[PDB]
Short mmCIF file of C-alpha atoms and ligand atoms in Angstrom, two decimals:
data_model
loop_
_atom_site.label_atom_id
_atom_site.label_comp_id
_atom_site.label_asym_id
_atom_site.label_seq_id
_atom_site.Cartn_x
_atom_site.Cartn_y
_atom_site.Cartn_z
CA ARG A 85 0.16 -0.21 -0.08
CA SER A 86 1.24 3.33 -0.98
CA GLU A 87 0.42 6.35 1.60
CA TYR A 88 -3.09 7.37 1.18
CA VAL A 89 -4.07 10.62 -0.36
CA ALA A 90 -7.89 11.19 -0.78
CA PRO A 91 -8.92 12.16 -4.13
CA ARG A 92 -8.49 15.65 -4.88
CA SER A 93 -10.17 16.26 -8.44
CA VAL A 94 -13.39 14.74 -10.21
CA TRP A 95 -11.43 12.29 -12.08
CA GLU A 96 -9.21 11.20 -9.22
CA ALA A 97 -12.69 10.45 -7.38
CA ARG A 98 -14.19 8.69 -10.55
CA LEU A 99 -11.16 6.48 -11.11
CA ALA A 100 -10.57 5.42 -7.49
CA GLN A 101 -14.22 4.43 -7.03
CA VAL A 102 -13.94 2.14 -10.26
CA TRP A 103 -10.58 0.57 -9.09
CA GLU A 104 -12.13 -0.20 -5.59
CA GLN A 105 -14.99 -1.95 -7.23
CA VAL A 106 -12.75 -3.93 -9.93
CA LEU A 107 -10.12 -4.80 -7.29
CA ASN A 108 -12.24 -5.18 -4.39
CA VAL A 109 -9.91 -3.20 -2.34
CA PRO A 110 -10.87 -0.21 -0.21
CA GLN A 111 -9.68 3.35 0.25
CA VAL A 112 -7.98 3.82 -3.10
CA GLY A 113 -6.01 6.99 -3.09
CA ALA A 114 -4.18 9.34 -5.49
CA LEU A 115 -0.84 7.62 -5.05
CA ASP A 116 -2.15 3.90 -5.39
CA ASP A 117 -0.72 1.78 -8.02
CA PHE A 118 -3.11 -0.69 -9.92
CA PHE A 119 -0.56 -3.35 -10.18
CA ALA A 120 0.95 -2.93 -6.84
CA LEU A 121 -2.59 -3.30 -5.63
CA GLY A 122 -2.91 -6.67 -7.27
CA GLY A 123 -4.41 -5.86 -10.66
CA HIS A 124 -3.06 -7.60 -13.71
CA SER A 125 -4.16 -7.55 -17.46
CA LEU A 126 -7.78 -9.03 -17.13
CA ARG A 127 -8.68 -6.60 -14.16
CA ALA A 128 -6.98 -3.77 -16.14
CA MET A 129 -9.22 -4.30 -18.97
CA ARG A 130 -12.19 -4.16 -16.71
CA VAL A 131 -11.22 -0.76 -15.37
CA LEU A 132 -11.11 0.09 -19.07
CA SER A 133 -14.39 -1.30 -19.55
CA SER A 134 -16.05 0.19 -16.35
CA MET A 135 -14.92 3.72 -17.35
CA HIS A 136 -16.30 3.38 -20.62
CA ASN A 137 -19.64 2.23 -19.33
CA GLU A 138 -19.96 4.73 -16.62
CA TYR A 139 -18.26 7.65 -18.10
CA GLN A 140 -17.96 7.08 -21.79
CA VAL A 141 -14.18 7.90 -21.48
CA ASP A 142 -11.99 5.39 -23.58
CA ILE A 143 -8.80 4.85 -21.91
CA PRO A 144 -6.18 2.83 -24.11
CA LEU A 145 -4.90 -0.25 -22.21
CA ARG A 146 -1.35 1.24 -22.99
CA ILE A 147 -1.68 4.43 -20.98
CA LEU A 148 -3.15 2.37 -17.98
CA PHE A 149 0.12 0.41 -17.89
CA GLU A 150 2.19 3.73 -18.64
CA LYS A 151 0.09 5.85 -16.19
CA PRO A 152 -0.43 2.98 -13.55
CA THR A 153 -1.21 5.50 -10.41
CA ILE A 154 -4.80 7.21 -9.92
CA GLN A 155 -3.07 11.00 -9.99
CA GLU A 156 -1.21 10.08 -13.43
CA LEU A 157 -4.41 8.44 -15.04
CA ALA A 158 -6.56 11.26 -13.81
CA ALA A 159 -4.25 13.92 -15.38
CA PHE A 160 -4.21 11.95 -18.60
CA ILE A 161 -8.03 12.04 -18.72
CA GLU A 162 -8.08 15.73 -17.68
CA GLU A 163 -5.35 16.68 -20.70
CA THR A 164 -6.99 14.49 -23.29
CA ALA A 165 -9.96 15.38 -25.48
CA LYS A 166 -9.96 12.28 -27.52
CA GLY A 167 -12.52 9.68 -26.48
CA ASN A 168 -13.40 11.96 -23.68
CA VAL A 169 -17.06 13.26 -23.78
CA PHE A 170 -16.37 15.40 -20.87
CA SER A 171 -13.89 17.39 -23.06
CA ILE A 172 -14.71 21.33 -23.36
CA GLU A 173 -12.85 22.65 -26.45
CA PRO A 174 -13.20 25.73 -28.38
CA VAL A 175 -16.28 25.97 -30.38
CA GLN A 176 -17.13 26.78 -33.87
CA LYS A 177 -18.27 30.40 -34.37
CA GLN A 178 -22.01 30.62 -34.59
CA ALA A 179 -24.82 33.48 -34.41
CA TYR A 180 -26.09 32.35 -31.17
CA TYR A 181 -24.94 29.92 -28.59
CA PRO A 182 -26.95 27.66 -26.24
CA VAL A 183 -27.58 29.08 -22.61
CA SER A 184 -26.27 26.73 -19.80
CA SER A 185 -28.94 25.19 -17.84
CA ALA A 186 -28.25 27.67 -15.08
CA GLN A 187 -28.71 30.76 -17.33
CA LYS A 188 -32.02 29.06 -18.72
CA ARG A 189 -33.53 29.08 -15.33
CA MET A 190 -32.57 32.56 -14.51
CA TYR A 191 -33.52 33.65 -18.00
CA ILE A 192 -37.10 32.32 -17.50
CA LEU A 193 -37.72 33.52 -13.96
CA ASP A 194 -36.51 36.99 -14.82
CA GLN A 195 -38.81 37.26 -18.04
CA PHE A 196 -41.71 35.46 -17.08
CA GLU A 197 -41.90 35.43 -13.10
CA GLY A 198 -40.82 39.01 -12.29
CA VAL A 199 -37.83 38.57 -10.00
CA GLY A 200 -37.03 42.20 -9.55
CA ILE A 201 -33.41 42.55 -8.28
CA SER A 202 -33.12 39.19 -6.88
CA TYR A 203 -30.39 38.15 -9.44
CA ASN A 204 -28.64 41.25 -9.06
CA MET A 205 -25.01 40.89 -7.36
CA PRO A 206 -24.26 44.37 -6.20
CA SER A 207 -20.89 45.06 -3.96
CA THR A 208 -19.61 48.33 -2.67
CA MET A 209 -15.93 49.15 -1.87
CA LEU A 210 -14.29 52.01 0.16
CA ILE A 211 -11.25 53.39 -1.61
CA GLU A 212 -9.10 55.57 0.26
CA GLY A 213 -6.33 57.15 -1.63
CA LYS A 214 -5.51 59.33 -4.74
CA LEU A 215 -7.91 57.26 -7.39
CA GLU A 216 -8.20 58.31 -11.08
CA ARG A 217 -11.57 58.15 -12.35
CA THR A 218 -10.73 57.73 -16.21
CA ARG A 219 -8.38 54.89 -15.07
CA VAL A 220 -11.24 53.34 -13.17
CA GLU A 221 -13.31 53.40 -16.25
CA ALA A 222 -10.60 52.10 -18.49
CA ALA A 223 -10.06 48.95 -16.33
CA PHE A 224 -13.69 48.33 -16.45
CA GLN A 225 -13.63 48.76 -20.24
CA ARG A 226 -10.64 46.51 -20.69
CA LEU A 227 -12.40 43.73 -18.29
CA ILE A 228 -15.36 44.07 -20.48
CA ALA A 229 -13.31 43.42 -23.55
CA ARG A 230 -11.63 40.43 -21.98
CA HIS A 231 -14.68 38.61 -20.51
CA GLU A 232 -17.16 37.46 -23.25
CA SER A 233 -19.77 37.18 -20.55
CA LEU A 234 -19.69 40.97 -19.81
CA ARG A 235 -20.32 41.23 -23.75
CA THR A 236 -23.29 38.58 -23.66
CA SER A 237 -26.94 39.57 -24.10
CA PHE A 238 -29.87 37.16 -24.11
CA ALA A 239 -32.60 36.70 -27.07
CA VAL A 240 -35.06 33.95 -27.51
CA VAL A 241 -34.38 31.93 -30.74
CA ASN A 242 -36.46 28.76 -31.89
CA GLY A 243 -38.34 29.00 -28.42
CA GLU A 244 -35.06 28.89 -26.32
CA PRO A 245 -33.15 31.53 -24.43
CA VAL A 246 -29.57 32.06 -26.14
CA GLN A 247 -26.59 33.77 -25.53
CA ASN A 248 -25.93 36.74 -28.11
CA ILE A 249 -22.11 37.65 -27.89
CA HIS A 250 -21.20 41.06 -28.87
CA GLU A 251 -18.04 42.00 -30.61
CA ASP A 252 -18.03 45.53 -28.78
CA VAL A 253 -20.41 46.98 -26.10
CA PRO A 254 -21.08 50.67 -24.75
CA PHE A 255 -19.88 51.43 -21.36
CA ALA A 256 -19.31 54.55 -19.19
CA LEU A 257 -18.56 54.92 -15.74
CA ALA A 258 -21.28 56.91 -13.81
CA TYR A 259 -19.42 59.37 -11.69
CA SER A 260 -20.98 61.40 -8.76
CA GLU A 261 -20.10 63.63 -5.92
CA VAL A 262 -21.92 62.87 -2.65
CA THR A 263 -21.84 62.91 1.19
CA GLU A 264 -20.77 59.57 2.83
CA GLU A 265 -24.14 59.30 4.24
CA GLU A 266 -25.83 59.88 0.99
CA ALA A 267 -23.68 57.15 -0.54
CA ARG A 268 -25.11 54.60 2.01
CA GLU A 269 -28.68 55.45 0.75
CA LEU A 270 -27.41 55.75 -2.84
CA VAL A 271 -25.77 52.18 -2.87
CA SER A 272 -29.21 50.52 -2.22
CA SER A 273 -31.22 52.67 -4.59
CA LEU A 274 -28.37 51.94 -7.20
CA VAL A 275 -29.24 48.29 -7.38
CA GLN A 276 -31.87 47.93 -10.26
CA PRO A 277 -32.97 45.46 -12.77
CA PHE A 278 -31.00 44.63 -15.83
CA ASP A 279 -32.62 44.34 -19.39
CA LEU A 280 -31.19 41.13 -20.40
CA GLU A 281 -31.32 42.14 -24.10
CA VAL A 282 -28.52 44.96 -23.61
CA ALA A 283 -25.07 43.89 -22.99
CA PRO A 284 -22.94 44.74 -20.87
CA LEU A 285 -24.91 43.31 -17.93
CA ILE A 286 -22.46 45.15 -15.57
CA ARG A 287 -22.77 48.84 -14.16
CA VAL A 288 -20.37 50.79 -12.30
CA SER A 289 -20.89 53.92 -10.25
CA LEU A 290 -17.88 55.86 -8.65
CA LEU A 291 -19.01 58.33 -5.69
CA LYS A 292 -16.51 60.61 -4.32
CA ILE A 293 -17.50 61.20 -0.73
CA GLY A 294 -14.32 62.99 0.13
CA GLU A 295 -10.99 64.73 -0.69
CA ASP A 296 -8.97 61.22 -1.41
CA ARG A 297 -12.28 59.08 -0.27
CA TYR A 298 -14.36 57.06 -2.95
CA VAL A 299 -17.14 54.48 -3.06
CA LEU A 300 -17.15 51.88 -5.77
CA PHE A 301 -20.44 50.52 -6.63
CA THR A 302 -20.37 47.61 -9.10
CA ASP A 303 -23.65 45.60 -10.02
CA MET A 304 -23.97 42.76 -12.47
CA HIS A 305 -26.55 40.10 -13.46
CA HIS A 306 -26.16 36.49 -11.96
CA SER A 307 -26.81 35.07 -15.39
CA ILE A 308 -23.14 36.14 -16.41
CA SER A 309 -21.33 35.75 -13.11
CA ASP A 310 -20.99 34.14 -9.70
CA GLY A 311 -19.11 34.42 -6.28
CA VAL A 312 -15.85 33.16 -7.79
CA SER A 313 -16.33 35.29 -10.84
CA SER A 314 -16.77 38.42 -8.77
CA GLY A 315 -13.36 37.65 -7.03
CA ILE A 316 -11.84 37.13 -10.49
CA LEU A 317 -13.26 40.36 -11.62
CA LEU A 318 -12.07 42.29 -8.58
CA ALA A 319 -8.58 41.02 -8.74
CA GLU A 320 -8.09 41.49 -12.46
CA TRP A 321 -9.64 45.11 -12.17
CA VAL A 322 -6.98 46.00 -9.38
CA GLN A 323 -4.17 44.26 -11.84
CA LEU A 324 -5.48 46.38 -15.01
CA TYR A 325 -5.57 49.53 -13.18
CA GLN A 326 -2.05 49.02 -12.36
CA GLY A 327 -1.31 48.18 -16.05
CA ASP A 328 -0.70 44.70 -15.69
CA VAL A 329 -1.07 42.22 -18.49
CA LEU A 330 -3.36 39.36 -17.91
CA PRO A 331 -2.86 35.59 -19.04
CA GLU A 332 -4.82 34.45 -22.06
CA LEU A 333 -8.04 32.64 -21.56
CA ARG A 334 -8.26 29.43 -23.49
CA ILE A 335 -11.78 28.69 -22.97
CA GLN A 336 -15.03 30.76 -22.68
CA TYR A 337 -18.16 30.31 -21.12
CA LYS A 338 -19.99 29.91 -24.38
CA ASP A 339 -17.71 26.81 -25.08
CA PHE A 340 -18.94 25.47 -21.53
CA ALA A 341 -22.38 26.07 -22.54
CA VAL A 342 -22.19 24.29 -26.01
CA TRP A 343 -20.42 21.29 -24.20
CA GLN A 344 -23.09 21.10 -21.82
CA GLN A 345 -25.96 20.87 -24.47
CA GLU A 346 -23.99 18.10 -26.32
CA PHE A 347 -23.21 16.29 -23.12
CA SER A 348 -26.88 16.08 -22.38
CA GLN A 349 -27.49 13.95 -25.39
CA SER A 350 -24.67 11.31 -24.23
CA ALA A 351 -24.72 7.90 -22.31
CA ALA A 352 -22.51 9.68 -19.72
CA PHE A 353 -25.21 12.23 -19.04
CA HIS A 354 -27.82 9.42 -18.57
CA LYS A 355 -25.23 7.90 -15.83
CA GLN A 356 -24.65 11.16 -14.02
CA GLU A 357 -28.50 11.54 -13.78
CA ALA A 358 -29.11 7.92 -12.82
CA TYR A 359 -26.91 8.20 -9.69
CA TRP A 360 -29.17 11.10 -8.60
CA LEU A 361 -32.70 9.52 -9.39
CA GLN A 362 -31.44 6.33 -7.47
CA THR A 363 -30.21 8.29 -4.80
CA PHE A 364 -33.84 10.01 -4.15
CA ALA A 365 -36.03 7.03 -5.64
CA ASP A 366 -37.49 6.19 -2.39
CA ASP A 367 -39.30 8.49 0.31
CA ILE A 368 -37.50 11.82 0.22
CA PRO A 369 -37.39 13.29 3.75
CA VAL A 370 -38.43 16.58 4.81
CA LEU A 371 -36.44 18.36 7.48
CA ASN A 372 -38.59 18.71 10.58
CA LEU A 373 -36.37 21.51 12.53
CA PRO A 374 -38.26 22.84 15.75
CA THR A 375 -39.12 26.35 15.09
CA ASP A 376 -39.77 29.35 17.30
CA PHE A 377 -42.72 30.48 15.44
CA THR A 378 -44.89 28.87 13.06
CA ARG A 379 -43.96 28.04 9.45
CA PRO A 380 -45.42 30.58 7.13
CA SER A 381 -47.70 29.25 4.29
CA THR A 382 -45.43 31.25 1.86
CA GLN A 383 -41.95 31.45 1.85
CA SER A 384 -40.38 34.37 3.78
CA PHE A 385 -36.91 35.67 2.86
CA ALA A 386 -36.17 38.04 5.85
CA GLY A 387 -33.08 36.73 7.38
CA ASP A 388 -30.55 37.72 10.07
CA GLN A 389 -27.19 36.21 11.00
CA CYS A 390 -24.93 35.14 13.93
CA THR A 391 -21.31 34.24 14.24
CA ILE A 392 -19.30 32.24 16.78
CA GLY A 393 -15.39 31.27 16.90
CA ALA A 394 -14.58 27.72 17.29
CA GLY A 395 -11.40 28.35 19.03
CA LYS A 396 -7.85 27.57 18.17
CA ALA A 397 -7.62 24.31 20.05
CA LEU A 398 -10.87 22.75 18.39
CA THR A 399 -10.00 24.01 15.01
CA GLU A 400 -6.71 22.16 15.26
CA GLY A 401 -8.39 19.01 16.64
CA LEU A 402 -10.91 18.93 13.65
CA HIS A 403 -8.06 19.19 11.23
CA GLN A 404 -6.31 16.09 12.85
CA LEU A 405 -9.56 14.19 13.02
CA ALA A 406 -9.92 14.94 9.10
CA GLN A 407 -6.17 13.48 8.70
CA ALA A 408 -6.81 10.44 11.05
CA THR A 409 -10.01 9.51 9.19
CA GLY A 410 -8.81 10.03 5.42
CA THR A 411 -11.40 12.79 5.20
CA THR A 412 -11.46 16.42 4.35
CA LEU A 413 -12.14 19.03 7.08
CA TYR A 414 -15.17 19.76 4.82
CA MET A 415 -16.44 16.33 5.41
CA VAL A 416 -15.99 16.13 9.02
CA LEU A 417 -17.77 19.55 9.52
CA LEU A 418 -20.63 18.43 7.32
CA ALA A 419 -20.94 15.10 9.17
CA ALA A 420 -21.15 16.99 12.51
CA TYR A 421 -23.59 19.37 10.75
CA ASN A 422 -25.87 16.32 9.76
CA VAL A 423 -25.67 14.92 13.48
CA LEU A 424 -26.57 18.50 14.83
CA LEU A 425 -29.77 18.61 12.41
CA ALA A 426 -30.35 14.83 13.33
CA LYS A 427 -30.71 15.85 17.00
CA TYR A 428 -32.70 19.05 16.53
CA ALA A 429 -35.04 17.48 14.01
CA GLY A 430 -35.34 13.84 15.72
CA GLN A 431 -34.71 12.36 12.25
CA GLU A 432 -32.17 9.96 10.86
CA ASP A 433 -32.27 10.63 7.17
CA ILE A 434 -31.39 14.19 6.04
CA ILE A 435 -30.65 16.12 2.90
CA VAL A 436 -28.20 19.11 2.93
CA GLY A 437 -27.64 21.46 -0.08
CA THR A 438 -23.93 21.85 -0.53
CA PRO A 439 -22.83 24.47 -3.28
CA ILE A 440 -19.82 23.66 -5.27
CA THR A 441 -17.84 25.98 -7.63
CA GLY A 442 -18.77 23.87 -10.95
CA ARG A 443 -15.26 24.56 -11.91
CA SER A 444 -14.19 20.86 -12.22
CA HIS A 445 -11.40 21.71 -14.71
CA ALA A 446 -8.46 23.81 -14.72
CA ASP A 447 -9.65 25.45 -17.88
CA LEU A 448 -13.04 26.59 -16.17
CA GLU A 449 -11.32 28.20 -13.13
CA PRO A 450 -10.41 31.78 -14.53
CA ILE A 451 -13.74 32.14 -16.52
CA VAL A 452 -16.29 34.94 -15.78
CA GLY A 453 -19.71 33.12 -15.79
CA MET A 454 -22.38 31.27 -14.02
CA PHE A 455 -20.60 27.61 -12.68
CA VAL A 456 -21.88 27.49 -9.16
CA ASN A 457 -23.86 24.13 -8.47
CA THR A 458 -25.58 22.77 -5.65
CA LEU A 459 -25.64 19.09 -4.83
CA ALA A 460 -28.40 17.60 -2.79
CA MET A 461 -26.17 15.67 -0.02
CA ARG A 462 -28.29 12.89 1.56
CA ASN A 463 -27.04 11.04 4.75
CA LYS A 464 -28.63 8.74 7.25
CA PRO A 465 -27.39 9.80 10.91
CA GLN A 466 -28.86 6.85 12.81
CA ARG A 467 -28.32 6.73 16.38
CA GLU A 468 -26.68 3.27 16.60
CA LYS A 469 -24.15 4.38 14.16
CA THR A 470 -20.53 5.33 15.24
CA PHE A 471 -19.58 8.95 14.08
CA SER A 472 -16.53 7.20 12.62
CA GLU A 473 -18.55 4.90 10.40
CA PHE A 474 -21.21 7.77 9.74
CA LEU A 475 -18.25 10.09 8.85
CA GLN A 476 -17.12 7.49 6.23
CA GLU A 477 -20.56 7.22 4.76
CA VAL A 478 -20.53 11.06 4.45
CA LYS A 479 -17.08 10.84 2.58
CA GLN A 480 -18.51 7.98 0.47
CA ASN A 481 -21.72 10.04 -0.68
CA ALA A 482 -19.47 13.11 -0.99
CA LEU A 483 -17.13 11.40 -3.62
CA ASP A 484 -20.02 9.71 -5.30
CA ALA A 485 -21.70 13.17 -5.54
CA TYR A 486 -18.51 14.90 -6.90
CA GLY A 487 -18.24 12.01 -9.64
CA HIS A 488 -21.70 12.72 -10.68
CA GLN A 489 -21.61 16.53 -10.37
CA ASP A 490 -22.29 17.15 -14.21
CA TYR A 491 -26.03 16.89 -13.93
CA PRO A 492 -27.76 20.23 -13.47
CA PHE A 493 -29.66 20.67 -10.13
CA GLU A 494 -32.39 22.30 -12.34
CA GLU A 495 -32.82 18.88 -14.21
CA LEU A 496 -33.03 16.76 -11.22
CA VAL A 497 -35.83 18.83 -9.49
CA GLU A 498 -38.01 18.65 -12.69
CA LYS A 499 -37.03 15.01 -13.19
CA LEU A 500 -38.19 13.89 -9.69
CA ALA A 501 -41.39 15.62 -10.18
CA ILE A 502 -42.74 17.40 -7.14
CA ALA A 503 -43.18 17.06 -3.13
CA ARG A 504 -42.77 20.79 -3.35
CA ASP A 505 -44.50 23.24 -1.10
CA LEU A 506 -44.05 27.12 -1.33
CA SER A 507 -43.17 27.42 2.25
CA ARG A 508 -39.94 25.51 1.69
CA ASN A 509 -37.45 24.76 -1.05
CA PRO A 510 -37.01 21.56 -3.33
CA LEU A 511 -35.03 18.59 -1.89
CA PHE A 512 -33.44 20.63 1.06
CA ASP A 513 -34.22 23.42 3.38
CA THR A 514 -30.86 24.00 4.63
CA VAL A 515 -27.45 24.64 3.10
CA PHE A 516 -23.78 24.19 4.35
CA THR A 517 -20.63 25.78 3.10
CA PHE A 518 -17.05 25.97 3.99
CA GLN A 519 -14.43 28.50 3.03
CA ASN A 520 -10.82 29.74 3.77
CA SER A 521 -11.33 33.52 4.65
CA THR A 522 -10.47 36.28 2.22
CA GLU A 523 -8.71 39.52 2.97
CA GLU A 524 -10.06 42.72 4.09
CA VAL A 525 -7.61 44.88 2.26
CA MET A 526 -5.70 43.80 -1.08
CA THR A 527 -4.31 47.42 -1.73
CA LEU A 528 -3.21 49.49 -4.73
CA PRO A 529 -0.14 51.69 -5.46
CA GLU A 530 -1.55 54.90 -4.22
CA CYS A 531 -4.70 53.52 -2.79
CA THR A 532 -6.20 51.01 0.19
CA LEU A 533 -9.39 49.04 -0.62
CA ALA A 534 -11.67 47.82 2.11
CA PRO A 535 -15.46 47.27 2.45
CA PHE A 536 -17.97 49.98 2.61
CA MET A 537 -21.40 48.43 3.66
CA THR A 538 -21.85 45.36 6.31
CA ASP A 539 -21.05 43.14 3.12
CA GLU A 540 -22.55 39.81 2.06
CA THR A 541 -26.19 39.06 1.94
CA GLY A 542 -27.13 37.87 5.43
CA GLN A 543 -30.44 39.95 5.75
CA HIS A 544 -31.86 37.83 2.96
CA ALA A 545 -32.37 34.01 3.56
CA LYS A 546 -33.43 31.64 0.61
CA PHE A 547 -33.32 28.72 3.10
CA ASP A 548 -34.57 28.11 6.63
CA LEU A 549 -31.00 28.40 7.49
CA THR A 550 -27.44 28.39 5.85
CA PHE A 551 -24.68 27.18 7.86
CA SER A 552 -21.29 28.59 6.93
CA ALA A 553 -17.81 27.41 8.43
CA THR A 554 -14.94 29.89 7.70
CA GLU A 555 -11.36 29.31 8.50
CA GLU A 556 -10.10 32.80 9.35
CA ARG A 557 -6.49 32.05 10.20
CA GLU A 558 -6.75 32.16 14.16
CA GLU A 559 -9.82 29.89 14.28
CA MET A 560 -12.56 28.30 12.28
CA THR A 561 -15.67 30.67 12.70
CA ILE A 562 -19.27 29.21 12.41
CA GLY A 563 -22.08 31.33 10.92
CA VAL A 564 -25.76 30.71 10.62
CA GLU A 565 -27.73 32.81 8.11
CA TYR A 566 -31.56 32.09 9.37
CA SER A 567 -35.11 32.88 8.50
CA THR A 568 -36.31 35.53 10.90
CA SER A 569 -40.00 33.95 10.45
CA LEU A 570 -38.72 30.75 12.10
CA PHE A 571 -35.98 31.33 14.49
CA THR A 572 -34.88 33.91 17.23
CA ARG A 573 -31.38 34.74 17.74
CA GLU A 574 -31.33 33.02 20.90
CA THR A 575 -32.31 29.69 19.40
CA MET A 576 -29.72 29.96 16.67
CA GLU A 577 -26.87 31.05 19.08
CA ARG A 578 -27.73 27.77 21.05
CA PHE A 579 -27.91 25.99 17.73
CA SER A 580 -24.29 27.12 16.87
CA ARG A 581 -22.95 26.26 20.38
CA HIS A 582 -24.45 22.70 20.17
CA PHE A 583 -22.56 22.34 16.95
CA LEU A 584 -19.25 23.03 18.77
CA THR A 585 -20.36 20.82 21.62
CA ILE A 586 -20.86 18.01 18.99
CA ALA A 587 -17.50 18.91 17.40
CA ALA A 588 -15.55 18.79 20.55
CA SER A 589 -17.25 15.38 21.65
CA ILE A 590 -16.40 13.80 18.10
CA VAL A 591 -12.67 15.06 18.49
CA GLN A 592 -12.41 13.62 21.80
CA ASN A 593 -13.73 10.35 20.54
CA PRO A 594 -14.54 9.73 16.98
CA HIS A 595 -16.01 6.23 17.71
CA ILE A 596 -18.80 7.64 20.05
CA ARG A 597 -22.15 6.51 18.70
CA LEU A 598 -24.49 9.10 17.56
CA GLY A 599 -26.95 8.64 20.26
CA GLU A 600 -24.63 9.03 22.95
CA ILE A 601 -23.25 12.36 21.85
CA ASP A 602 -24.51 14.59 24.52
CA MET A 603 -25.46 17.71 22.85
CA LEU A 604 -27.60 18.86 25.75
NA1 NA B 279 -16.59 6.76 -4.17
#
C-alpha cells in the first residue's frame, strides 16, 4: 500500500471508485498503483470497460500501463479530448449559442416570473487614496473586452433563451460626488434590474465622498457571473488599473455552454442522472427542525445572521480528525452538521444542500460566468452508528456526488416531479458551506481598498438556514444565516454552541455512537 492521499479532483474520485469495485480493495487513493494493488491484465481491461460504461471515457490499455497510478491516469483524462465526452474545447463560431442550464432558469424566472433585483450581484468598496476616475473606467472597459460574459446579451431563438455575444459594447463609468451618508442610501437605490437584451450586464458608479475617499459601486446580473467570478473581476480590475498584462483565456463560457448541451445527449449524462434518480428514488425526507414561530404558508426571505468562533484548539483537533480518518475538514464538518440537524429534528435521514464551484477542470477556473452548482447531499445519521462510520458514509456519498456532479440541479428537480411546498425549497431546506477566509484589504499603489457597507447578503435568507464554516487564520468561525420568520437569535446562538459541543465530542472520541453524543 502506498501512503493514502484522498481524491483531489473529479477524475481522481471517479477512477478511485472504479478501482475499488474492480479490484475489491477499499480506500484507493491518489498515489495507489493498480498493479501494486494486485491488478493484472484481466482486471486492467475491466477498469477500461467500467470507465467506458459509466463515463464514456475510452482509456487505452497502453496508457493504464504507462500511467499506473490514480493521479497520473486522472491527469491523462484531464488533458485528453480524444474519446472523452467531458472535454470542453473551443467551439465553432455561430450566430447564437445555447444558454447553460443555470442561465436558462434565471432567464425564464427573470422574464416570466418577475424576479425584481433578486439576480443582482451588487458590491461596494471603500477606496481611500488618490484614485483616477478615468483609469477606473478604462480598467472596466478592458475587463469587458476580456470577458465574453460581460459582452453577452440574451434573446429567444427557436423558443429557447440563447446567448448573443457582442463584438464590442458601450460602457461608461457613472461618476457622482456625494456625502458619505448620501452614499449609504444611494448604494441601495442603485441596485436596479437589468434588461437582459442589452450588454454589458455590468454597471459601475464611482462616488466621491471626500478629498481622497471614494465608494465604488458595481452590479452585474447573475446570469453572466457568480461568487468566484466576482473575485476574479475584482483581482483583475486591480491588476488592470496598475497596467498589468493578464494571461490569455483558452476557454470561454459559451464553450462550456455548447459542451453542456452536447453532453446532455450522451450515455455519460444518463449515468450522471441515474445516480441522482437512484439516490432519491424512495421516500424523500422533509427536515423537521423545531421552529420558534409557525412556518409561514408562503416562503419568507427575511433573514439575520449570527457568528461564533470555534477556538484554536478545536479547529486544530478537527483538522487532525480529518487527517486521521482519511477525510477532508469539509467532510468532518458536514458530518457534524448532519448529527446536529438529526438531534434537533429527531430524524435519521437528512438532505443538506452543498454548493460547489462547478469549475471541475483547470480551464473553467479563470472564466467569468455562472458555474456554481448545488448538490443535494443525503445522509443517514442513525443513532446506532458510530460517528466514525457515519463520517465514512458522508465521505463516500460526497465522493459519489462529486463523481456525478455533471447533472444540473435544475434537471433533477424537474425529473423527480414534486413534493414541493411554497413554504420550503426543493430537496433541502438547509445549506452547508465551508470557505478559507479572504482579505479585508488587497491594496493599490496609491490607494487602500476595504468594505463600505456590512457586506454579503445576510438579511436575505433563501433557506430555513444556511450554515457557514469559515477558516479565519486564528480559528474556524461558525456562521448561521437564518429565516427571521422561524427562529429567534437566542435559538440560533444555542444551535451554534451545540454544533461546537458535537464537534468537541467527536474530536475527543470519533467512535462515539451518534445517540450517545451528549449535545444537551
Ligand atoms: Na466513491
